[PDB]
Each structure stands twice: as C-alpha cells, then as structure tokens.
RNA sequence: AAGCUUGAGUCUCGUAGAGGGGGGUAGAAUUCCAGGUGUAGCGGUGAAAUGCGUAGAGAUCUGGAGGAAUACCGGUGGCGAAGGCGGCCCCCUGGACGAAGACUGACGCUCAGGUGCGAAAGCGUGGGGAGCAAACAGGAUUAGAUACCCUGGUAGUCCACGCCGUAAACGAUGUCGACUUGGAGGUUGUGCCCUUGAGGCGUGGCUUCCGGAGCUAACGCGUUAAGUCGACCGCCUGGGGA
RNA sequence: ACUAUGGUUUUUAUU
RNA sequence: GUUUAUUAAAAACACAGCACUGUGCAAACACGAAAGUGGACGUAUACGGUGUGACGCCUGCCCGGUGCCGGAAGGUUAAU
C-alpha cells in the first residue's frame, strides 16, 4: 500500500504500512490462538478515549 | 392526551401584552380539558443571532397536558398573531408532570 | 389500535362477568370496534394500501372467530348479530 | 359536480355536462336586477367597426355590493347565484339590521351560515375583517386598489390575490398578472377565494353552440378568393410570401406595446 | 436525547463557527453523535445556538 | 355434543426502529436574472476540438428568481411481505420484545379461480427544470462512425391524478408444523455490577461469520439449512425448434 | 495508485 | 349543417384537438384630423392572427438563399 491521503499530517502514524498485512493478516482473526490474549485481556485494558 | 412544553420566541417588548395572551392561552386549553403546569416564566433571553433590529426575546413556556388530535389547531393561536416567531409544542422528554 | 376508552366499552358490555376477557363474542366485539377507531386513517386517497389490508386482516381473523362460533353453539352467532353491527 | 354518459344513439356519443344543486333555482332579488342597457356598439360614424360581433340573449347585471362599509353588523347567506356577464359567481347575503345584498361570492362558504363585518370578525372567507391585520399568506378575495373604483382583481372563477410582503404601514400584493403590487392596505379585501371553483369543467360540445355564444368561426386564408383575403388564390395552394392578417399586415416575432406611463406601479414581469 | 435548553453542554460539541465537531476527534461515542447532532439541532431552531455564521 | 391443554388468541404497564401516510420548518453546493467593481482569458481530455471574448466573456459584491436529493452521523447497523426506506418537528399506524396477573378453549394451516401492490421505462392533460441524461444539433474519431472522448441538450427522473403491471422481481432457497449442534460478534430488552465497561457475566428476540451431524457431482447449505420429514399448492420427464 | 490509441480474423495435414 | 336560385351536391367550407405567433389589461387588436367606439363587468385553457384537422398510432433530411427576430459595435445616411 498505497491509498491516497485524505487528511495532511506531515509525520506518518504506521497505521497504514507494513502493520497491517506484514504482519496483520491471518494470525489473529477468528480463534486463532485465543485463550484470553487478542479479546479478554483486551477487554479489561482501560482507555480514556473509546475505542 | 400527551405532554408538550411549548416554547416560541415573543417580541421583548410585548412583554406587558403577554399576561393577555395567557388569559386566552388557558382558556383555549382549559376549554378542551387539558391541564397546565407552569405558564408563568422562563425569561427575556439574548439570542444566537439579531432578528427585527433587535438581539433578545421573551420565552414563557407553557409544560401542558392536551389532546394531540388538536394539537396543530391550537398552534394557529401562535401563528395569526404578529408579536410571535417559530414556535414549537415540543412533546413529553420527561415532562415537569409525571402523574404524582 | 383501539382506545382505553373504546375498548372498555366492549368489555363492559360484550361479557357475563366481572372483567371477562375471554369469550369469543368479545374478540369479534373488539375487532368490530378497532374498525371503528380507523375512521380518520383510512379511504382518504389511492396511495395508501396498509389500512385497506389492516382493515382485510381484522376482518380475516373476524371470520375465523364466526366461522368457528356458528358451527360450534350455532345460536351465540344469531344472538351476536342484534347487538353487534354486522350486514345494516 | 361534473356527470358524463357513454354512447347511446347516432350522433349522441360520449358527452360530458357541469351540474350545481346548490345554485339557487328561482329568480334575482328585483330591486338589485338592473337591465345592463347597451349604446349598441355604433362607432363615431353610426356604424359598426368589430366584425362578427354578437350574443348574449339581455346580460342583465345583479348590481353586487363594491361600495360598502360595515362594522359590527353580522349577515347571514341565503344564497348562491350566477351573473350573465362573468364566471366569478355571486352570493346573496341579509344582514342583521338589516338589507338584502349581492356579494361577490367567496369560496369556503354556503347559504345558512353567518359572518361579521370589519375589526371584531374572526379570519374566515367572507368576513371582510381589516387588510392591516392579517399575516403574509392571507388570501384577501377581491381587492379594489383605488378608493371607491370597484371590484378590481380576482375577478374570474377560484381566483384570488395573496399578501405577501409587509412594510409598516404598507402590504404587497402577488397578483396572477405575475406582478409584485403595493398598497397601503385600504383595500376592501372581503378574505378568501372566488366563487365555486368548477368553470374550468365545461366543454361547450356542438358546434350549433356557437349561435348561443354569438361568436362566428374564423376561416383560412387559403380557403378565401384573392379579393376578400391576402392569402387568397389560386390552385397552386401558396402565397408565395410571409403570413399577414386579412388586412394585409405581419406580426409573428413583432412584439407590440403602447403604454409607456405606468412605470412607477409595474415591478414584476411575469416569465 | 433528553434535553436541549441548557447551552453549556452543546457549547463543547461545536466550534466558534458554530460547525460540529467529528466523534472521531472528541473521544465521544457515535450513537451519542447522533442525538447531540439533535439536540444541537433543537438548540438551533430555540434561536440559542447559530445555524451558520453568515447570518 | 360437550370437556381439557404444552396449539392458537384477549386486557393492563414497559423496550427499539431511514417501515408507511399527512402537515409545520432549516441547510450545502450547483444554475439563471439586474446593476455595480470591470479584467483577459474562461471552458474540456486518454488526446484534440466545437464552446467562449475584443460589439468586453470568466470572476466578485448586494439583491431578485429557482430545482432536486438531504450530503457528515451511515456501521462487519435498524425497519419493510417485498420493490425499497436517512435534515429537524407533530399526529396516526401493521409487526417484533420485557413482564405480573386474570380470561377464551382447537378458534389451526394451505390454496386452483379471484383480488391487493412498482426499482424502472411506457400511456397522458397541465406545472417544473438546477443535477444527470437515452433522443438530438455539433465537435470529433478514423481508412470509416451513426459509437468511446467533449461543449450544449429532449424524453425522463420531480408535482397533482389515474392506466400499465416490468426486471437478474438474486436472499440461487414455495407457504405452513415440530426437531437437531458448538463458537464468536453486532443490535434490543432484563437481573446484578461501588459498570476495566463504544459495556461485563447469565437469560429472551433479531441477525452475521466460522464450524459439527445429515444432504450434495461441486459451491457448499449448515438450526433463519441444500438437514429430518409431516399438511397443501404450483410445475416436470434428452437438446434445439419455442 | 507512477503517464492513450482502434480493423483484417489458416487451407489440405489426421494415412 | 353551409354549397353553383334554371347542366355540376361531392372528395370543398369547419369542431373538441396539434402548433406557431401578437397580448399582464390604460392588453394586444380593428376604426378614428376630433369627441372617442367596440375589444370589456372579458383578464392568458381569455382575447387577436395563420397553418393543420376529431379519434388511434407516428412527426425524415436541409438555415446555402428570400423573409422574420435576436446581437448590437462600425459604415454608408436625411432632418439638424
């Protein structure tokens, strides 16, 4: 990727590169692993924004 | 029947016009078996923008119990009148009144 | 859709006892009076097919209550008919 | 109401016809019956100038009340009537003190039901309560713009004049003209729409119609010998030329205007 | 959707421009969007908040 | 010809919704008109030209005119029998659901014939005309073109009132009845949280993805089934011709 | 996401 | 229905309808040295003028030219 900016920032965030698909695909969807690391832990971490 | 606050912004110095409009605001419910809760005051307030080379207007609110098959009928007292601009009946939204 | 009002003076009259909820002739009673709560709502104009099928759909479940009544007692039917508005 | 039957005999095919239950079916109110006599269309030298010229039977005229004032003084209607010359149709009214007049019928209104006069009447049609009361988007009925003239617009079957800018002590006008007209709200402005509504459902039908119309049709240039016609002829079928009227003149994309002394009261052209 | 008299709360949810501030950037929930964008609205047409600042 | 009940229904207080029908009322960007301030470019592409100005366009300022959908929120979200349905505000309305009592007493299901209903365009009288656009004047294109591309643009989309009944009308799954097997999200009630809490852990409704029995040539369907058979209807028996 | 072109359109082969 | 009174009665003339074009009402229009007269107590589906002919189903191509209107600068050009 690729994809045209929509909104100028000039430092980028690694939201969109490299995180996302090397590495971010198929090693988390659907209960792959589970246990309570990629849900219920996540569950109990606070944030002071939503998320 | 159905709760409306009714709420429309009157001309600042009709002020004094007010309690006679109120006279024959009660009486056009009253005569239809509604009950009133308030009808006295909510205050002359500055507006977000001017209107008639003027900055403020008065608001009475009415907090009402009517039949809501009348309802539109009513709100032409409002509407032929001169000194009043965009009112609206505004329903229930945990009304002043809840049957205590 | 049937008032507090309207529906109170169904059960009050349509019964043999004290708040009587189930009878068959008060469930046809009732129906015949939630077509008359639909005055107002209905034949105003062509675009509108909901009340017309409202209207056909009490009317379905009104024949399948009479249906029933006039094979099962026979004479609860030719009763209900000089009390109720059915035909004139 | 309108009623139309299909085909039943030769010649009397499908036909429509208007029909009112309504409209009185006894005689005008005598005194308020006057005979609408006419010099008899003879120009400066003793003859007539308008070709084929013509009808009605007598257009005897109903007076109708244009010059009133009344305050107070309540009315009743008795009836709903038509006047030979016009399709606004008329309303007899008694008032409670009392006369018998004719009213330029307003709309919304029927015969046994009462109205009021002036400052102390409710805003229904026919209550000629004051024009410098009313909000923007009153219909006024029939207006009269100078003192004392008579029933100046809305004149003609469900028309009406509507208000809809005021200044003070001034009101304008929307007017079917297309125009933006101002006054100082001294209008007689009687409040609401005129007439019944229902002119507009006519057919008139057969062409034997036309005699009681007193109107004579209009026939082709083409079809005239070259004498009694500028387009007459000739076997070629063709003039050759540009189309005129029967005195030999063109007007198609010549535009004609007169008046140049109303410029102050024109404000909107109609598009 | 219970309110729309009292200002200091909708005053948070609009600029000096009068224009509404995105979910995305107030740390504010969506379904709430979507009622404070009606109770700005019902706050408009009170005449207490602006429409827009043309005008 | 009567009785019962776990089918199927009645009444009271609460839960969610762009479902439908009617009235009250704001915005954003685009398009024309008048006079100012008045200038040489303004328009369109993959490319190019017609357009548009020297008789002064485009743009900008204050007014006047005016149409269509309501943009953001809008979702791996609601609601509707479906086709479809999003600015606020007020009434009326078919279904679905929480929950304590009391009443019917098999009142249930399907359906030939019949009958109800448009995303679309077509019939048509009078209004409307900004987006977009078959038709259509042109620019072209090219060897050619009637097309791709581009300037302008009618029917039509919009309004009142009626006819037409169309489609891939595809949710690939007739309408009804009672069963089967786990996980995880969303959405809405409800019990309890000194609410890590765009909630949590159970329990009712809806629903989506993954997945097991069974069924399938294959896709997979997968409790809302392509499974299990029970009611009733519609329809079939090599392909083309049709 | 990172730079335009559009047409002609094998016959015997297989004994 | 109107039509060659005495050789010619039809297939011509015209109606709801389609379209162009003049008219916002002191209208347009016709007539008028002048008073005015009609249009008209009508008011845009109402009024004036010309094509085409109800109904049902359609509406080719052409603006070089003559005519007509718009664009308004310039030229020639009379009163002055």
Redesign the interface.
């Given at each position: 990727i690729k994809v045209r900016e929509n909104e100028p920032f000039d430092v980028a965030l690694r939201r969109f590169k490299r995180s996302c698909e090397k590495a971010g695909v198929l090693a988390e969807v659907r209960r792959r692993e589970f246990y309570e690391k990629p849900t219920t832990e996540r569950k109990r971490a606070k944030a002071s924004a939503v998320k | 029947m159905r709760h409306y606050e009714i709420?429309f912004?009157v001309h600042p110095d009709q002020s004094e016009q007010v309690p006679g409009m109120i006279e024959r605001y009660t009486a056009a419910i009253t005569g239809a078996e509604g009950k009133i809760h308030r009808l006295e005051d909510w205050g002359r307030?500055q507006?977000?923008?001017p209107?008639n080379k003027l900055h403020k207007?008065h608001y009475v609110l009415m907090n009402v119990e009517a039949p809501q098959e009348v309802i539109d009928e009513l709100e032409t007292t409002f509407?032929?009148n001169?000194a009043v601009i965009?009112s609206?009946v505004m329903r229930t939204?945990?009304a002043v009144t809840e049957a205590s | 859709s049937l008032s507090t009002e309207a529906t109170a003076k169904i059960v009050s009259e349509f019964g043999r006892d004290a708040n009587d909820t189930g009878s068959t002739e008060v469930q046809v009673a009732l129906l015949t009076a939630q077509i008359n709560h639909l005055q107002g709502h209905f034949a105003e104009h062509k675009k509108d097919h909901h009340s017309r099928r409202g209207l056909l759909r009490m009317v379905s479940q009104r024949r399948k209550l009479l249906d029933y009544l006039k094979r099962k007692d026979v004479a609860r039917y030719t009763q209900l008919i000089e009390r109720l508005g059915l035909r004139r | 109401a309108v009623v139309k039957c299909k085909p039943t005999s030769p010649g009397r095919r499908h036909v429509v016809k208007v029909v009112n239950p309504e409209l009185h079916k006894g005689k005008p109110f005598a005194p308020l019956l006057e005979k609408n006599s006419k010099s008899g269309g003879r120009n400066n030298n003793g003859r007539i100038t308008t070709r084929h010229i013509g009808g009605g039977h007598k257009q005897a005229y109903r007076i109708v009340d244009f010059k009133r004032n009344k305050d107070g003084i309540p009315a009743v209607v008795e009836r709903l009537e038509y006047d030979p010359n016009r399709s606004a149709n008329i309303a007899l009214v008694l008032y409670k003190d009392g006369e018998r007049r004719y009213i330029l019928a307003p709309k919304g209104l029927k015969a046994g039901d009462q109205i009021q006069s002036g400052v102390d009447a409710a805003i229904k049609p026919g209550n000629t309560l004051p024009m410098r009361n009313i909000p923007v988007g009153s219909t006024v009925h029939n207006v009269e713009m100078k003192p004392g003239k008579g029933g100046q617009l809305a004149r003609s079957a469900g028309t009406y004049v509507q208000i809809v800018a005021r200044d003070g002590a001034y009101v304008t006008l929307r007017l079917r003209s297309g125009e933006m007209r101002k006054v100082e709200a001294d209008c007689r402005a009687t409040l609401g729409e005129v007439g019944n509504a229902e002119h507009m459902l006519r057919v008139l039908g057969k062409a034997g119609a036309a005699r009681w119309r007193g109107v004579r049709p209009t026939v082709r240039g083409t079809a005239m010998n070259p004498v009694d016609h500028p387009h007459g002829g000739g076997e070629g079928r063709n003039f050759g030329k540009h189309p005129v009227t029967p005195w030999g003149v063109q007007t198609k994309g010549k535009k004609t205007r007169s008046n140049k002394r109303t410029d102050k009261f024109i404000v909107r052209r109609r598009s | 959707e219970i309110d729309y008299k009292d200002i200091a709360t909708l005053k948070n949810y609009i600029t000096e421009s009068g224009k509404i501030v995105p979910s995305r950037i107030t740390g504010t929930r969506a379904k709430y969007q979507r009622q404070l964008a009606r109770a700005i609205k019902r706050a408009r047409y009170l005449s207490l908040l602006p429409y827009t600042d043309r005008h």
């Open positions: - | 709420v912004m307030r507006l977000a923008y209107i207007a509407r032929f001169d965009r609206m939204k945990h | - | - | -």
